[PDB]
Each structure stands twice: as structure tokens, then as C-alpha cells.
Amino acid sequence: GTDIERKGTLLFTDISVDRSTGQIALRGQFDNPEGVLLPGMYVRVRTPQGLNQNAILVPQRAVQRSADGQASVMLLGEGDTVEVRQVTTGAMQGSRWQI
Amino acid sequence: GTDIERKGTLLFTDISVDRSTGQIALRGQFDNPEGVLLPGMYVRVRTPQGLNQNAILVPQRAVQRSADGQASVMLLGEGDTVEVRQVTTGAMQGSRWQI
Amino acid sequence: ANTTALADYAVRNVNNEIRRLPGVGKLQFFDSEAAMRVWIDPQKLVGYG
Amino acid sequence: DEVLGKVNGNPKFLYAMMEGLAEAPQLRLVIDREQARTLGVSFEAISSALSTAFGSSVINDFANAGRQQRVVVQAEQAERMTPESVLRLHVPNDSGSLVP
């Protein structure tokens, strides 16, 4: 609900899994010089899930989705023909899907 | 949800039945050198229910059931005569009845 | 060939027009229209209590 | 059987058959109501679990491209193909624990 962003470093990753929900806890450290971040506030932490050196990004508008959920892109085949080729959709960045 | 498979040995079989669930608890030991198996994680254990040295498996489409629920099979007797032999079905593996 | 998607298209675009036509009394559909299928795994539910 | 033997054995008819399905095997579930109640299991829980797992339960409606269509909940294909899958189901008790 606000435009307040803070950079931080990952301190700890838990080894035990929460029995009631099945998710692991992680703790990061964030500098709070202005006192803006108050204890108990609900926050959403964007954490990097790894770097792939050979990824392909295609704008979201260029990917159609059929009724089965199998997404497709249209390619310029030989002779400038439109080909509907099925692709597997990965991550979402801005307005460009990861293929 | 993963393909991670680990071999282990059954250590302990409880003699007391849980009153709330009517189930017995068992404890096995599994090697975890990489630390992949985390505490609290819900896992499925395939445990052998014994070895049947003379297990006879017949196609399910070969077993008939009468009005009393008794199972029978048609056998090719002497002189290419069809005989009716009553059988008892065990467990089901795929499309085949254990007799 | 996804008979499900084709059947959904037929229901949305074809069956209603035909049923509106004069003279048609009943349209018996030899398939089923789309729906939201939830295939639950009971063992996962057991594991999560 | 008497009629169809006198008739199917009678050459007056090309064929004579049960317009209808012949009797089929059924898997009766004997439920110890006393044992289930002692473990804190209501009959409602068993009925709801069995119905939703095998008979498929229509919960409510959802808007698919402007049309109201059912949402149907059913057990996964691999988890309902054998009679042992019936016995592998669990239901909750009064204390919140799951009983197979």
C-alpha cells in the first residue's frame, strides 16, 4: 500500500519445516534509519531465485493462450508465414513473459 | 512433489495403537548426507508388506463374480471343455487380480 | 485434439444459435460443456491434516 | 431366464435380449458405526468424504468468459482406481486427528 522500498541482505534460512503449513522461514536484515519500518508490519520480500544466463523474454502481448492453458507464440516462418508454436511459460517480469 | 528417493531401514514398530486414530506408529532411519531431508517435511514411505513367492496374477477381465459375491474363473479342462473353478482374489496390481 | 475446448466453443457459439432457430424442439449434446475441475490428492490432505 | 430360454431357443425370433443392463458386481462397504463413533468419526464426515472423493462434488459456480459453470471436486485418477484406494482415505475425528 505504500511506495517505501528497502534493500537488505539474507541472513538466515531455516532448516526445519513448519508442520502445520509446510513452508520454511527465512530472516533478512534491513537497515531502518528513518524508523519507517515498524515491528509487526506485513511486508512482501522479493528474494532472488537464482540467475539463469540463457533465458528468453518475450512481451506478454505476443503470447496467446489456448483454452487448454497451453500458451503459444506466433513465429515468422520461411516465406514470412505465421506459425503457432506452443511454448512453456516461466516467470513474469513487467510486461514480458519468460519463455 | 519431487523425485528425491532415499533408501532406509525400518527401526521400530510400536506395540501400542493410538486411541484417537486407531493406527500404529513406525520409525525408520534414512541417510541424509546432503541435508536434503528436512525435519517436518511430509514424505511417503513405500514399505514392503512381505514377499509372496507364488503370487498368481490373472487379468481382471478373466474373473467372474456370482450373485453371492464369490469369485470364479473359467478353465480349459481336458478335451477343450470349460470348467468353473472358484477362486479367492487378493490384492489388485494394475489390471490384474492376485489369486 | 482437445474435445473439451472444441465442445466449449460449440456450446458458446453454435448450440445457442441453433436452439434459437424456429422448429428445433430439443438439442441433445453428445458431450459436456466446460467446468472447473479440482483433482484433489487425498494423501496430500492427510499429510497436511 | 425361463422366457429367454423358451424364446432365444425359439426360431420365431431373430434375437431376444434384455433391453437393459445386466447385473454387475458391487463393492458393499460395511461400516462399523460403533467403531467409527468411538474413534470420534461422524457419519456425516464419512458420507461427505466418500461422495466428494468418488462421486465428484459440485461445489459452486465460477464465471468462465461470462458464463456460470460448475466447479467439480473429485479425487485424482491414480488415487481412486482400486478398492484399496477406498480404504486409504482418511476422515477427521472430533479431536482434529485423521483416522483412515
Side-chain angles (χ1 to χ4, degrees):
Chain A
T2 77
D3 295 319
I4 308 160
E5 205 178 337
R6 287 294 186 269
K7 290 308 132 283
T9 60
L10 180 71
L11 286 193
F12 168 72
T13 303
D14 208 316
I15 285 80
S16 71
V17 181
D18 183 281
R19 174 161 291 91
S20 207
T21 54
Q23 299 185 21
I24 61 166
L26 305 97
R27 173 167 290 177
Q29 185 180 313
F30 292 80
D31 308 332
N32 172 26
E34 300 88 16
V36 177
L37 301 185
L38 327 173
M41 167 174 9
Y42 180 88
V43 295
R44 239 182 256 259
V45 193
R46 323 177 73 197
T47 66
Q49 304 300 123
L51 171 70
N52 53 10
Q53 287 279 10
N54 320 314
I56 290 168
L57 302 190
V58 175
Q60 178 179 7
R61 66 181 179 207
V63 185
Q64 288 186 31
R65 283 189 173 260
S66 41
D68 56 353
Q70 291 184 340
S72 58
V73 297
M74 68 281 262
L75 288 183
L76 197 80
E78 296 189 353
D80 301 323
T81 56
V82 176
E83 301 177 3
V84 170
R85 175 184 281 178
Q86 292 190 345
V87 293
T88 84
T89 53
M92 210 45 275
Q93 190 197 16
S95 60
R96 304 184 298 159
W97 249 93
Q98 181 192 18
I99 306 303
Chain B
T2 78
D3 297 319
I4 303 168
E5 196 176 334
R6 291 294 191 274
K7 328 285 306 310
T9 53
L10 177 70
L11 286 192
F12 164 68
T13 300
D14 207 316
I15 211 53
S16 69
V17 180
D18 182 283
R19 223 168 264 235
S20 148
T21 64
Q23 322 181 40
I24 65 166
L26 306 101
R27 169 166 285 178
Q29 181 178 312
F30 296 81
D31 300 335
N32 187 36
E34 305 87 15
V36 178
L37 302 179
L38 302 179
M41 225 308 296
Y42 161 94
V43 291
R44 315 149 176 225
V45 290
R46 323 181 73 194
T47 162
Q49 303 302 302
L51 171 69
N52 206 317
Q53 281 266 8
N54 304 320
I56 285 170
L57 304 191
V58 315
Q60 213 145 357
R61 63 167 81 214
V63 178
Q64 324 295 73
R65 289 197 178 269
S66 39
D68 54 350
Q70 156 72 306
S72 63
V73 291
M74 293 324 73
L75 292 176
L76 190 75
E78 295 187 355
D80 294 318
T81 61
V82 177
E83 296 182 3
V84 175
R85 194 167 290 169
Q86 298 184 340
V87 292
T88 302
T89 58
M92 270 197 34
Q93 191 197 16
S95 59
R96 297 186 294 160
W97 259 125
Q98 178 195 17
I99 321 295
Chain C
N2 223 345
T3 162
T4 306
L6 188 55
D8 191 58
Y9 183 95
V11 171
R12 290 177 189 271
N13 307 112
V14 183
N15 294 25
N16 27 54
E17 292 297 315
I18 291 327
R19 70 181 48 262
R20 163 277 303 178
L21 266 308
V24 52
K26 176 176 174 170
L27 299 80
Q28 160 280 114
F29 200 46
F30 274 125
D31 210 334
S32 173
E33 80 294 351
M36 195 53 133
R37 300 302 301 200
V38 189
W39 311 102
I40 60 180
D41 204 347
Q43 301 306 309
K44 297 179 140 229
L45 282 193
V46 175
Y48 288 118
Chain D
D1 175 301
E2 191 178 352
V3 163
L4 287 177
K6 294 168 185 174
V7 153
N8 282 321
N10 196 331
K12 284 189 176 181
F13 327 113
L14 171 64
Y15 71 95
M17 44 53 46
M18 197 127 48
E19 9 154 338
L21 269 274
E23 308 281 315
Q26 300 183 356
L27 183 69
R28 149 100 43 169
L29 305 188
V30 185
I31 305 169
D32 190 334
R33 306 249 198 153
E34 326 311 329
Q35 216 172 346
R37 191 62 171 165
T38 297
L39 298 168
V41 181
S42 81
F43 201 75
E44 173 288 7
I46 305 165
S47 31
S48 187
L50 284 166
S51 67
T52 312
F54 289 91
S56 72
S57 190
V58 180
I59 308 302
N60 55 313
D61 323 68
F62 94 105
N64 193 5
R67 318 187 71 269
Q68 291 299 326
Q69 294 185 315
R70 305 305 191 172
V71 183
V72 190
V73 174
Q74 200 175 22
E76 185 48 88
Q77 196 181 203
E79 297 296 329
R80 58 182 176 82
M81 277 317 73
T82 79
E84 297 79 22
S85 302
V86 154
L87 298 182
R88 283 186 286 150
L89 245 194
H90 294 62
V91 293
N93 63 358
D94 70 355
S95 74
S97 298
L98 294 178
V99 189

